[PDB]
Symmetry: D2
Subunit: 315 residues, 4 copies
């Protein structure tokens, strides 16, 4: 079953969140890459991504995807070259080169991931639909819109018009700010009487202090982000709210690890009809008392850093 | 080089801190276990631990240790029998039991790991040395001592007298509180004219709010600990302080992942002699950045239950 | 010098910010009222406010104002009648009512203080100018505007058109959010070719967690606000920013005590020309010290109810 | 009724906390001093203090004390001259000079306040009892003892032996650390089979981060302490716990204002049989919901400073 088939039938598709983030974190060896893909699959991901040999990358993904109920998706991000002034025919040529690797490896679908400029997001979708494969487009923007002042609603409209059947947001903000952005996008599609499936790949980092440029501008980016990491409970709340908003492609970006994906899969186990592939016996009474979801759902966890602030100023 | 030859040759032994926590976190598949081991070895760990299939765990650990400059260590922790009050010979029997397997698999050394009672740790040391292999003993206690009131200085002295060639602290507090405990253990050994290598396997979780029982009593244990996780800069400061205090077997316990081990190897790359296998590009910015929690609606500390 | 002569002569008018909050805090005795007034005048305030016995309040204020370089001002705030939906002529009547007393006691000027609705503020301005005395109008709104959605730029324009010689913001947010609102009010007046003196009477409580309704909706209002209190360094930064933005009637509202007013006078002593009546000895240490809350078990922000 | 009479009958005596702190805060004029004394009396204080003309100071205190149920107490603090090496006969001469002003003005009792060295605290009590007036002694020390390593228990013992009928702690730590110190003192008196009334004049500032030197060593001392100020609820909890510990002279030191004293008086209004000399009608429902002691007693108030830490390192 393909990605549009699943989603058209109202299924909840779970992404393989921060694959790249995790490979980075682990210090990367096909075995290392195959093992990570497997952890995401075991956690419940229905998508195994590959990027940009590029062919071995695609092979390993396909290999693990065949071990469960998952698809292989090829992703492309913004060229770093747009800031390099050079953009246009040059941009589509790069996308085109990557499109070939993917068609050649016969991926299940494509994702225009990481894009801060709608204009460039569009060029990507235009090039990608020429494969005849389903295309998903996400924008690395918050409620205020992209780098040109293009609002989320309008960005959503233009991406669908360009041919994306799945739109959403990713990689710049935490789950809460990301879903607010997706709500804006959803309202853009409604007002324009257009339809598309929605997806969200938020950061697993809390970013209440970020400005419109996202977490990259926080002073802790990228080596002091540990304190902000979402617990599994934070992610279950995100999964539930995403589900309630109409999001059906629920994933994650930087900060996401297999256990965050498993939390999504477990939170939505009822709705999905299945679970992805002993605290109550602990010796201490007060520890046993924590073996109840309600306890964690209501606990305001401490940071453990009394000498540090709870927020920082961007820049 | 054996564990003791390394240490006597002035080398820094990097532990594979967090092994069990990582597998638990990744959700566990010999390949899954083999990969995790490789990550630690690749991060610079000189020890691949193995516990209690048993023959398999020991075999995978040995295979990855073979792949690099690492030893395999057999770990033993506090037993239910002792807490369930069977004491004496009875407790010595389960360790002997465990030893057997580590004997047959021929592990390089043994660690009496995770003991909240000095007494039971001693009984563990006395049993493990019957293996003729070097024995390391670590206590899950803080500056205030073990569960019967035995202070760190004394605990260190009884562990060495019992035959441990390496002693220290592990798994109950963050790096700073753990090293203060180690300092107390070291002053004890000195006041007693005793000598032994020191080790530390602290939590990678900041724990300023814990009482003498350790992080377990904190209400966030074990599923709400994320905010407390040490950054690599916190870990590098820990490695540096540990080295300066005289610690030469530097590892970690719950919360330590491979990247934390790697921070230790890089920090101490000059003292070791090699590395393990825009203004934010400067290490001193990170060493001085008071990172934010990102959780303004949450407290900074909790009271232990 | 009258309020308007002072301002046109380039002077900085220091308000007696916090008067009601202080008396409320001290628990209220004409002597008690007279002393509080003296504290503000002694801290540098150039205005002694009076509201609504009435003749007494006005008399005590005048006596202390007489003692120094201060004016007496009659304050009027949003009425229940307007919120209780009587609007139009009815609301104008209670202000006229209030004016009467301030007319007989001969106060120096009038302030339409504390209005969450531009419309009712205008009706207040239109009534108060019938006194022939200068009228100041301040809004209890933030950057997002009043309760009907009227933005700061527009609110400022309608208040001046209505006859207010002085406009600004008061009592709903901390100094920074209040001055951002003032900046918006100033851009409105500019886009409309209008001119008027500006004033600010912010809360002395830090309020980063409030929504458009102001600090009242925070769960700590009104008895758990202590941690939020501005230090004198926070107040000096506010005075300096207010001056730089062009504000010349600089006061405060809830939370401001005499020492906060004094911080304003000292900060601006060079721009005024006089003062009001071991490495911690340096002002730049205080200007840079990120003070601790002393409440590690409490959050740093709360969600408005 | 005198101070020993009240306390011997088991009455709860309420101090006039941070009189000096408050006068400082207000920028100081007999009228200013009389008004402050009155606010404390109106708040419930049974003691009006005067210090070190000194005579006018004593007159005003007496004057206001006569307006209610209060006594006038003369207080003496450590000489700053002990750090000036000069100490002994020199110290008692200063105390003696002050003792005369007070006997001359006929105060009701005397307080050896602010003392960081037990040795010097003792000299003060020795000089002061020579007036035939009741003497109270407090130490500015925490659980670890004074500047010489003299523990609280022993300090308590020596002060009583020197002639103090009332002992306690003050001016260096918050209510919680101060009462722990008083508990230690109380245990010292018990073990030595001695008896004395207990008193506490803690800071109204939370100081969980202070070292044995007290709040003077925190970096915010003395101009950045605002965030630490106790709410009236924090003080009611202190009053109740002080009462439960056996403390019967309940006061305060730096940071205390009349409203903190009133909170003590109200918390203990039942036990005392009287109160010292409209939120529920507020327009907003959620505001009306706060007119219940339980709400405040259970509310973990926010600091309002997300960009600041919750604790600082001493020094
Ligand atoms: Sm390589
Ligand atoms: Sm939220
Ligand atoms: Sm299984
Ligand atoms: Sm530290
Ligand atoms: Sm009355
Ligand atoms: Sm600011
Ligand atoms: Sm003077
Ligand atoms: Sm407490």
């Amino acid at each position: 079953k393909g990605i549009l088939e699943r989603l058209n039938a109202g299924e909840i598709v779970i992404g393989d969140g921060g694959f790249v983030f995790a490979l980075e974190k682990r210090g990367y060896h096909p075995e290392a890459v195959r093992q990570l893909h497997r952890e995401f699959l075991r956690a419940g991901s229905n998508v195994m991504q590959t990027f940009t040999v590029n062919e071995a990358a695609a092979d390993i993904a396909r290999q693990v995807a065949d071990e469960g109920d998952a698809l292989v998706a090829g992703g492309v991000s913004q060229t770093p070259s747009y800031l390099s002034a050079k953009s246009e025919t040059e941009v589509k040529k790069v996308f085109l080169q990557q499109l070939e690797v993917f068609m050649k490896k016969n991926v299940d679908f494509l994702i225009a991931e990481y894009f801060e400029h709608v204009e460039e997001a569009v060029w990507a979708v235009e090039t990608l639909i020429a494969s005849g494969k389903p295309v998903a487009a996400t924008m690395a923007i918050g409620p205020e819109g992209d780098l040109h002042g293009v609002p989320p609603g309008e960005a959503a409209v233009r991406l669908v018009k360009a041919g994306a059947s799945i739109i959403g947001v990713n990689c710049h903000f935490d789950p809460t700010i990301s879903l607010k952005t997706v709500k804006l996008m959803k309202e853009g599609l409604e007002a324009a009487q257009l339809k598309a499936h929605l997806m969200s790949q938020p950061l697993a980092y809390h970013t209440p202090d970020a400005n419109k440029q996202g977490f990259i501008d926080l002073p802790e980016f990228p080596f002091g982000l540990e304190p902000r990491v979402a617990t599994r409970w934070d992610i279950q709340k995100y999964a539930r709210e995403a589900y309630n908003l109409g999001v059906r492609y629920i994933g994650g970006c930087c900060g996401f690890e297999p256990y965050h994906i498993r939390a999504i899969a477990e939170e939505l186990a009822p709705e999905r009809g299945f679970l992805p592939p002993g605290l109550d016996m602990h010796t201490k009474p007060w520890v046993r008392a924590r073996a109840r979801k309600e306890y964690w759902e209501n606990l305001r966890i401490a940071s453990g850093r009394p000498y540090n602030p709870s927020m920082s100023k961007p820049d």
